[PDB]
Amino acid sequence: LDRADILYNIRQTSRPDVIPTQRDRPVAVSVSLKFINILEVNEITNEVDVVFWQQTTWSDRTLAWNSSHSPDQVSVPISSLWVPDLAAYNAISKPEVLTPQLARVVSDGEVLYMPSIRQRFSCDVSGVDTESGATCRIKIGSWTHHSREISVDPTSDDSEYFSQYSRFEILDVTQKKNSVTYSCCPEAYEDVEVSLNFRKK
Amino acid sequence: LDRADILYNIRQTSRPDVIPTQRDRPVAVSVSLKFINILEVNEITNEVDVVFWQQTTWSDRTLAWNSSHSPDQVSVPISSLWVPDLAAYNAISKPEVLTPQLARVVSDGEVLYMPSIRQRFSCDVSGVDTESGATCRIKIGSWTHHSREISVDPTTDDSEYFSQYSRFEILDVTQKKNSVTYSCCPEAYEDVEVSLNFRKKG
Amino acid sequence: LDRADILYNIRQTSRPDVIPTQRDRPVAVSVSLKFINILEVNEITNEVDVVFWQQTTWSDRTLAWNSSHSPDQVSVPISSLWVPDLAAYNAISKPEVLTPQLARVVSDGEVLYMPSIRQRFSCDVSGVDTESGATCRIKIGSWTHHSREISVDPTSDDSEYFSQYSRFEILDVTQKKNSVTYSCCPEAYEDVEVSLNFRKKGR
Amino acid sequence: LDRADILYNIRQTSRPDVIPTQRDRPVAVSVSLKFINILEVNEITNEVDVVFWQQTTWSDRTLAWNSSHSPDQVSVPISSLWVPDLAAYNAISKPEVLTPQLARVVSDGEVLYMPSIRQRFSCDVSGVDTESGATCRIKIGSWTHHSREISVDPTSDDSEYFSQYSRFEILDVTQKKNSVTYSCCPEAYEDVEVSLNFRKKG
Amino acid sequence: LDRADILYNIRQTSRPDVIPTQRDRPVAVSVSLKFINILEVNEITNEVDVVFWQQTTWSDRTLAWNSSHSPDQVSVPISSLWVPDLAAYNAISKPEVLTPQLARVVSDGEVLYMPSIRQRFSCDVSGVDTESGATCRIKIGSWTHHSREISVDPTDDSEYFSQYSRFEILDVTQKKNSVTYSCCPEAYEDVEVSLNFRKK
Ligand SMILES: NC1(C(=O)O)CCN(c2ccccc2)CC1
Ligand SMILES: *[C@@H]1O[C@H](CO)[C@@H](O)[C@H](O)[C@H]1NC(C)=O
Ligand SMILES: *[C@@H]1O[C@H](CO)[C@@H](O)[C@H](O)[C@H]1NC(C)=O
C-alpha cells in the first residue's frame, strides 16, 4: 500500500463521531503537556496565559493497515479521525491551536496528536515572585465520556521544550491521574491533573 | 446495537432543524447555570464577564433505541441533534463555548447538553464591594420558540463548581421561571431568570 | 402537514441566493432597530459600540404552505432562506450576531428575522455629556439591491427594550426612510436612517 | 429568463478558479478606493487604520445572458464567481470585509464587486497634524497574476463618501497605475498606487 | 490545453492530503522569509510582531501537464493542492495570512506559494536599542513530517522591508537545522531565520 491508498481508506471509512471502544473496554487516552511558554500571569486575578504541546495518544484499530511494503506512519487531518473530547475544566479561554490540525497514525492504529495550544487558566498564581514559586493546577479530561468509555493515563526533562526567553522558569511539572464525580451524574470522569510549579526570573 | 449503529441511526434520521414536539405539547427544556468563575466586573458600566456550565436537558423520542444488550448513553455532536435555540436576553457578547460541542443522549431519548460558556452581561453590579453583594440577573430563553413550542423550567451547593481562586465569592444563586413579551411579537417567550448574588473577597 | 414536512420542503427547494421578487414588485423589507445597550462611546473619535435587535420582515411566497391542520409558523435556519443583504453604511466593525441564526416563517411566506447585533459606528457623539445629548445617525439598506429589487421601510416605542443598567439613557429614536445615490453607482439605494438621541447619566 | 434561472446557470457553470482571459489578452481589472473613515493613526509607528469601499470591475463573458425580457443585473455570491486575487502590498492586517460578499453581474458579463473593507497599513503618517497633512500610499495589485494575465487600471477629493464625523479630513486622493518587479522574478505585477493626503482637524 | 482544462484536472485529481513523495525520497521544500515589517517589539517579554512573505517552493509531479500550446503556469487555490504543514516552532500566535490563498503551479509540477503572514514570536529581543541590534531566531519546519518525508532547504535582504518601520534590518541569515526531542525518535528539518534588527 502507498500513502495515497492508506489516506483514501482512512478518509472513506473514518467514523469520526464513533469512539473506538474494543469489547466494551475504555479507550486509553495518554495526555502529557509540554510547556513551551508562560506569556502572562496575574497574581490578583489568579489567571495564567500559557503555550503547551498537548501530547495525546490512543489506539483506533479501525485505522490499522498491513505495514509490509507500506509506510509505518501517515499524517491525517483530525477531521478524518475520532479524537478524544478533552477539555481543561479550569480553562477561561477557548484552546487556540497554533499548528496544522494533523495527527500521526501508525499502521497498528496508534494515533499521536500533539497540537501547540495557547490557552488561559484560572489557577493558584500565589507565590509566583517567591523562590518556591506558584503551583498552577490544570485539569484535563473527557467532557462527555465517563471511566467506562475513556480512561486518561498521565504517563523526562520539564525544561527540554520551555523557551529560554520566557520571563518565567519551570521548577517542576507533575502529572497525577484523578477522578471527579458531579451531583448531576452517578459516573466518574477521569482527568489528568498537571501541576505547573514555576516562578518569575 | 453497538455505538457505531446508534450514532449512524441518529446521524441519518435526527432532523436537527425539527423541534421534537409531541402531540402539539411544548418541548420541556430544563436549564440550570453552574457558575465556575467571575472574571471581570465593572460597577460603572454594570457589566460582568462570567464562566458557567449551561446544564440543558429535554426529550427527543426520535433519538430513542432499545437499551437491551446496547449502551444506555452515547456522545453525539450537537450538529447531529435538534438543540434548543437558547439565548441570554441581556448578553452583550457572543457565548464563547470552551468545551467540545457534544451532548449525551440516553436510550429513552433524553438529551443532556452542558457547554462551558464564557459570556459578558449587562446587569446590576451595584453593591459588589458590600457584604450584601451585587445581584446580577441573567435571563435565558428560546430566541424563536414561544410558550406553545418550548417551555423553560429551572432544574433546582451553589459553590460546588465555583473556582476557589476567583477574586469573587457566591452568596446565593436563585433560578426562577418567568416570561417576556415585547411589542414586536404577540407571543410570550418563557425564560429562566438566574439571580447571581456575589461580592468581592476581603 | 407537520413541522418535519414543512422544514423538509423548505430545505429541499430553498434557493437562498434568489431574491423572491414577483412580477412588478420589489421585495418590501421592513427594518426597525430596538436598542438594548450602548456599551462604549468616544466623543474624540466619534465612535459608538451598540447592541440592538434588527427586526427584519419580508415576504417569500416560495416558502408558503396550506395552514389548514398545519403549524402557522416554523423556525428555519437562515442558511435555508434568502435573507436581505442589509449593511450599515457607517459601520466600522462587522455585525457580531449574538443570537441563534433562526428566522420565523409564517404559512403565508412572511419571514421574521430579528438577530441581536453588536456593532461599532462612525456617527456624531458630540454633546453626549449634555442634557440635549448626542444624535448618532445609523443608515441601514441593501448593499447590492437597488429600489427596483428591494424597498426598505421603517416598521414605535424606543425604551421598551433598553437596559436600565446602561451608563447611557435614550432620549429619542426616530427611524425614517431615505435614499442614497453615489457617483460610483447609477441606481438609488433605499435605506432606513435611525437617529439615536442619547446621553450619559449623572454618576 | 428570470433571476432564479440566471443564478442557477451561474452557480452550475461558474468556474471560480478560472481567470476569464479572452484570446490570450489580460483581464482588465478597474480598482478605485472610496475612503469612508480614518479610525486610528500613529505618527510614531507609521500605521493607519482605514475603512474604504474597494470598487472593483472586470468582464467575464462566461456569465453573460440574453437581457431581452430578463433582468439586466443579478446579485451573485463571490464564491460563485472568479474574483481578482487583489492584495494591498503594504497591509499589516487581513482585509476585514464589513459588507455581504455579493457582486453585481450585468447581462453582458461585467462584474461590479465593491466590498467595504477595514484594514491597517504601514505608510507615511509624518505631517498628519500639519496643514499640508500626511500622504499615505496604499499599493493594490494581483498577488499571483502578472501583467500578461491581469492589468490593474484606476477608474479627486473623496468628500462624497468620507464621514463628516471623522477626526480626520481628506485633502486629496490620487490613484495612479504602477508596476512592481523583483530581481528574482522576470514578470512585472501591475498595481494601483493610492495616495491618501489627509490631516487631523483643528 | 487551456487554463480551464488544467484547473479542472488539478481540482479533480488533487489529493491535498497526500504528500507527493517520489520513490520514497523526501519532498524538498525551499523556504525563505522576506521581512516586510516589524510592528511591535518587547525587550521585557522577548516577543516580536512581524510581517513576512514566506516564499515556499516544492515539486508535485501529479500537477504536471504538457506545456506545448498551453500556459506555462496557473494560479490554484491551496485548498486544491497538497501544501507543506510548516509551523514556526517558537510562534506564540496563529499565522495571520494577509493575502489571497492561491499558489502558482508551473507545467513541470513546481509549486510557488508565497503568503504574506503576520505572526508573533518568542525570541531574543535583547540589544534592540543598541548598534549591534537584537538577533531574533525564527525556526520553521514540518509539524508532522520527519526528514525522510520532508526536507527544508533555505534559498538582497531589505529589498522588501518597509522604509516606514521604526526598525531597520542589519542582517537576515537562513540556515538549515534539525530538531530531535526525547518524545519522538525522528529528526525534523527546519530553517533557522536569524533576524538581526534594531530601533532607528
Ligand atoms: N506565487 C508567487 C511566487 O512566485 O512565489 C507569485 C509572485 N508573487 C508576488 C507577490 C506580490 C506581488 C507580486 C507578485 C509571490 C507569490
Ligand atoms: C427490546 O428488545 C429485547 C430483546 O430482543 C426485548 O425482549 C424487549 O422487550 C424489547 N423492548 C421493547 C420495549 O420492545
Ligand atoms: C438572443 O436574442 C436574439 C434575438 O432574438 C436571438 O437571435 C439569440 O439567438 C438569443 N440568444 C440565445 C442565447 O438564445
Tab-separated table of N, CA, C and O in Angstrom, chain B residues 49-109:
chain	number	residue	atom	x	y	z
B	49	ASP	N	-18.276	39.672	33.317
B	49	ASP	CA	-17.681	38.632	32.449
B	49	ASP	C	-17.627	37.361	33.290
B	49	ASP	O	-16.934	37.366	34.319
B	50	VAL	N	-18.374	36.332	32.896
B	50	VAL	CA	-18.617	35.121	33.730
B	50	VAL	C	-18.391	33.854	32.895
B	50	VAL	O	-18.535	33.895	31.664
B	51	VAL	N	-18.007	32.770	33.556
B	51	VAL	CA	-17.915	31.393	33.007
B	51	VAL	C	-18.914	30.536	33.770
B	51	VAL	O	-18.864	30.532	35.000
B	52	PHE	N	-19.794	29.836	33.060
B	52	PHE	CA	-20.810	28.930	33.648
B	52	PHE	C	-20.997	27.703	32.753
B	52	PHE	O	-20.770	27.781	31.531
B	53	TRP	N	-21.397	26.594	33.369
B	53	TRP	CA	-21.905	25.397	32.669
B	53	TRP	C	-23.414	25.556	32.528
B	53	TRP	O	-24.081	25.724	33.569
B	54	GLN	N	-23.907	25.543	31.291
B	54	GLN	CA	-25.344	25.706	30.975
B	54	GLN	C	-25.979	24.328	30.863
B	54	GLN	O	-26.132	23.845	29.734
B	55	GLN	N	-26.295	23.712	31.994
B	55	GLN	CA	-26.931	22.369	32.049
B	55	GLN	C	-28.316	22.470	31.394
B	55	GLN	O	-29.179	23.183	31.920
B	56	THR	N	-28.490	21.778	30.272
B	56	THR	CA	-29.694	21.822	29.414
B	56	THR	C	-30.146	20.383	29.180
B	56	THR	O	-29.294	19.565	28.778
B	57	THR	N	-31.415	20.083	29.454
B	57	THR	CA	-31.996	18.736	29.252
B	57	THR	C	-33.361	18.884	28.591
B	57	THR	O	-34.072	19.890	28.838
B	58	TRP	N	-33.696	17.906	27.762
B	58	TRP	CA	-35.005	17.819	27.072
B	58	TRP	C	-35.090	16.395	26.523
B	58	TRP	O	-34.072	15.665	26.541
B	59	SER	N	-36.265	16.030	26.044
B	59	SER	CA	-36.533	14.691	25.486
B	59	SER	C	-36.744	14.838	23.971
B	59	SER	O	-37.431	15.778	23.542
B	60	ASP	N	-36.105	13.972	23.192
B	60	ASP	CA	-36.376	13.812	21.744
B	60	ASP	C	-36.542	12.309	21.496
B	60	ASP	O	-35.525	11.604	21.428
B	61	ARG	N	-37.782	11.850	21.397
B	61	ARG	CA	-38.156	10.417	21.284
B	61	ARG	C	-37.634	9.836	19.964
B	61	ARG	O	-37.419	8.622	19.918
B	62	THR	N	-37.386	10.665	18.939
B	62	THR	CA	-36.875	10.196	17.624
B	62	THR	C	-35.433	9.672	17.779
B	62	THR	O	-34.995	8.951	16.890
B	63	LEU	N	-34.731	9.999	18.870
B	63	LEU	CA	-33.350	9.518	19.135
B	63	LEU	C	-33.353	8.154	19.849
B	63	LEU	O	-32.279	7.551	19.937
B	64	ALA	N	-34.493	7.724	20.394
B	64	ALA	CA	-34.584	6.573	21.330
B	64	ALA	C	-34.181	5.271	20.630
B	64	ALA	O	-34.432	5.150	19.438
B	65	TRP	N	-33.583	4.339	21.369
B	65	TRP	CA	-33.283	2.961	20.893
B	65	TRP	C	-33.539	1.959	22.026
B	65	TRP	O	-33.595	2.376	23.189
B	66	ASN	N	-33.674	0.682	21.679
B	66	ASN	CA	-33.835	-0.453	22.627
B	66	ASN	C	-32.502	-0.662	23.366
B	66	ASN	O	-31.523	-1.064	22.710
B	67	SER	N	-32.467	-0.410	24.674
B	67	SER	CA	-31.234	-0.447	25.512
B	67	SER	C	-30.796	-1.891	25.818
B	67	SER	O	-29.649	-2.066	26.268
B	68	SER	N	-31.649	-2.897	25.593
B	68	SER	CA	-31.315	-4.328	25.849
B	68	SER	C	-30.086	-4.696	25.000
B	68	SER	O	-30.130	-4.499	23.768
B	69	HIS	N	-29.012	-5.154	25.653
B	69	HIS	CA	-27.717	-5.545	25.035
B	69	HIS	C	-27.149	-4.387	24.200
B	69	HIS	O	-26.534	-4.657	23.154
B	70	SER	N	-27.322	-3.145	24.657
B	70	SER	CA	-26.842	-1.915	23.977
B	70	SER	C	-26.332	-0.932	25.024
B	70	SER	O	-26.681	-1.038	26.194
B	71	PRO	N	-25.527	0.077	24.634
B	71	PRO	CA	-25.201	1.185	25.529
B	71	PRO	C	-26.473	1.888	26.037
B	71	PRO	O	-27.442	1.954	25.312
B	72	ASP	N	-26.427	2.406	27.258
B	72	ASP	CA	-27.518	3.213	27.857
B	72	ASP	C	-27.440	4.653	27.329
B	72	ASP	O	-28.487	5.333	27.317
B	73	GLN	N	-26.236	5.104	26.942
B	73	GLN	CA	-25.960	6.504	26.537
B	73	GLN	C	-24.886	6.540	25.449
B	73	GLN	O	-23.991	5.681	25.461
B	74	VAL	N	-24.952	7.542	24.573
B	74	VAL	CA	-23.868	7.849	23.600
B	74	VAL	C	-23.605	9.359	23.619
B	74	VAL	O	-24.502	10.129	24.007
B	75	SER	N	-22.396	9.738	23.223
B	75	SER	CA	-21.963	11.130	22.983
B	75	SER	C	-22.217	11.452	21.508
B	75	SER	O	-21.769	10.668	20.636
B	76	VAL	N	-22.941	12.537	21.245
B	76	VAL	CA	-23.389	12.928	19.877
B	76	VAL	C	-22.985	14.378	19.643
B	76	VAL	O	-23.259	15.234	20.478
B	77	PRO	N	-22.352	14.706	18.496
B	77	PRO	CA	-22.082	16.098	18.153
B	77	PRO	C	-23.427	16.822	18.007
B	77	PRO	O	-24.352	16.223	17.493
B	78	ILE	N	-23.532	18.051	18.513
B	78	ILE	CA	-24.832	18.789	18.550
B	78	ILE	C	-25.290	19.115	17.122
B	78	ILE	O	-26.500	19.300	16.930
B	79	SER	N	-24.384	19.145	16.147
B	79	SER	CA	-24.735	19.333	14.712
B	79	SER	C	-25.642	18.189	14.243
B	79	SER	O	-26.345	18.380	13.258
B	80	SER	N	-25.636	17.033	14.922
B	80	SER	CA	-26.494	15.872	14.586
B	80	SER	C	-27.790	15.833	15.409
B	80	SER	O	-28.491	14.852	15.273
B	81	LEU	N	-28.097	16.855	16.209
B	81	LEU	CA	-29.310	16.868	17.078
B	81	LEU	C	-30.069	18.172	16.927
B	81	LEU	O	-29.425	19.207	16.747
B	82	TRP	N	-31.374	18.136	17.133
B	82	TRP	CA	-32.117	19.372	17.471
B	82	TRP	C	-31.640	19.825	18.850
B	82	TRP	O	-31.544	18.972	19.750
B	83	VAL	N	-31.337	21.110	18.978
B	83	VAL	CA	-30.911	21.748	20.250
B	83	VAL	C	-31.778	22.975	20.450
B	83	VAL	O	-32.099	23.662	19.483
B	84	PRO	N	-32.227	23.269	21.688
B	84	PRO	CA	-32.990	24.488	21.947
B	84	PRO	C	-32.161	25.727	21.545
B	84	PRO	O	-31.003	25.791	21.843
B	85	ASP	N	-32.803	26.683	20.889
B	85	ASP	CA	-32.202	27.967	20.455
B	85	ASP	C	-32.178	28.936	21.646
B	85	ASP	O	-32.753	30.029	21.535
B	86	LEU	N	-31.515	28.556	22.736
B	86	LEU	CA	-31.445	29.393	23.962
B	86	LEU	C	-30.541	30.593	23.704
B	86	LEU	O	-29.533	30.452	23.018
B	87	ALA	N	-30.925	31.742	24.244
B	87	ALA	CA	-30.127	32.982	24.236
B	87	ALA	C	-30.310	33.683	25.579
B	87	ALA	O	-31.398	33.582	26.176
B	88	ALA	N	-29.256	34.356	26.032
B	88	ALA	CA	-29.288	35.272	27.176
B	88	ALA	C	-29.752	36.637	26.670
B	88	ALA	O	-29.011	37.260	25.905
B	89	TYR	N	-30.940	37.074	27.095
B	89	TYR	CA	-31.612	38.307	26.599
B	89	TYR	C	-30.781	39.545	26.951
B	89	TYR	O	-30.877	40.529	26.207
B	90	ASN	N	-29.957	39.487	28.004
B	90	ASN	CA	-29.131	40.642	28.452
B	90	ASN	C	-27.635	40.366	28.216
B	90	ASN	O	-26.816	41.060	28.828
B	91	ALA	N	-27.283	39.436	27.319
B	91	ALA	CA	-25.885	39.210	26.889
B	91	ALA	C	-25.422	40.390	26.038
B	91	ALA	O	-26.225	40.905	25.244
B	92	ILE	N	-24.161	40.792	26.192
B	92	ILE	CA	-23.542	41.874	25.376
B	92	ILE	C	-22.324	41.322	24.627
B	92	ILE	O	-21.617	42.131	24.004
B	93	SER	N	-22.104	40.005	24.656
B	93	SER	CA	-21.081	39.302	23.839
B	93	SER	C	-21.658	37.964	23.359
B	93	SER	O	-22.632	37.472	23.992
B	94	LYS	N	-21.096	37.410	22.281
B	94	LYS	CA	-21.446	36.062	21.784
B	94	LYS	C	-21.072	35.057	22.864
B	94	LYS	O	-20.043	35.210	23.513
B	95	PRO	N	-21.864	33.993	23.102
B	95	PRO	CA	-21.421	32.932	24.000
B	95	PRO	C	-20.148	32.296	23.421
B	95	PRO	O	-20.166	31.906	22.292
B	96	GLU	N	-19.058	32.295	24.185
B	96	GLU	CA	-17.776	31.632	23.832
B	96	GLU	C	-17.815	30.233	24.457
B	96	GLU	O	-17.744	30.121	25.698
B	97	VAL	N	-18.032	29.203	23.639
B	97	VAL	CA	-18.147	27.794	24.113
B	97	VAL	C	-16.730	27.255	24.287
B	97	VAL	O	-15.985	27.278	23.318
B	98	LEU	N	-16.376	26.826	25.496
B	98	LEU	CA	-14.988	26.450	25.868
B	98	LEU	C	-14.794	24.942	25.734
B	98	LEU	O	-13.638	24.500	25.811
B	99	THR	N	-15.873	24.186	25.532
B	99	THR	CA	-15.867	22.709	25.626
B	99	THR	C	-16.238	22.097	24.282
B	99	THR	O	-16.855	22.735	23.435
B	100	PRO	N	-15.895	20.812	24.065
B	100	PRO	CA	-16.346	20.087	22.874
B	100	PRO	C	-17.878	20.136	22.767
B	100	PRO	O	-18.565	19.951	23.753
B	101	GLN	N	-18.370	20.383	21.557
B	101	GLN	CA	-19.806	20.570	21.244
B	101	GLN	C	-20.468	19.194	21.078
B	101	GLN	O	-20.967	18.895	19.985
B	102	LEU	N	-20.456	18.397	22.144
B	102	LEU	CA	-21.088	17.060	22.214
B	102	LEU	C	-22.181	17.109	23.275
B	102	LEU	O	-21.985	17.785	24.288
B	103	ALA	N	-23.282	16.406	23.044
B	103	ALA	CA	-24.335	16.156	24.039
B	103	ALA	C	-24.374	14.665	24.345
B	103	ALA	O	-23.880	13.857	23.524
B	104	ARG	N	-24.896	14.309	25.526
B	104	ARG	CA	-25.157	12.914	25.933
B	104	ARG	C	-26.608	12.586	25.585
B	104	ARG	O	-27.498	13.350	25.983
B	105	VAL	N	-26.833	11.508	24.857
B	105	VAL	CA	-28.199	11.022	24.518
B	105	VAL	C	-28.404	9.683	25.227
B	105	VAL	O	-27.578	8.768	25.035
B	106	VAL	N	-29.472	9.597	26.029
B	106	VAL	CA	-29.873	8.362	26.758
B	106	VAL	C	-30.789	7.571	25.818
B	106	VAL	O	-31.457	8.202	24.967
B	107	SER	N	-30.835	6.246	25.973
B	107	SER	CA	-31.595	5.309	25.110
B	107	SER	C	-33.088	5.668	25.059
B	107	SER	O	-33.737	5.293	24.071
B	108	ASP	N	-33.615	6.362	26.067
B	108	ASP	CA	-35.042	6.792	26.107
B	108	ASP	C	-35.237	8.113	25.344
B	108	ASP	O	-36.381	8.549	25.252
B	109	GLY	N	-34.166	8.726	24.827
B	109	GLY	CA	-34.257	9.950	24.008
B	109	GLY	C	-34.069	11.214	24.827
B	109	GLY	O	-34.228	12.321	24.266
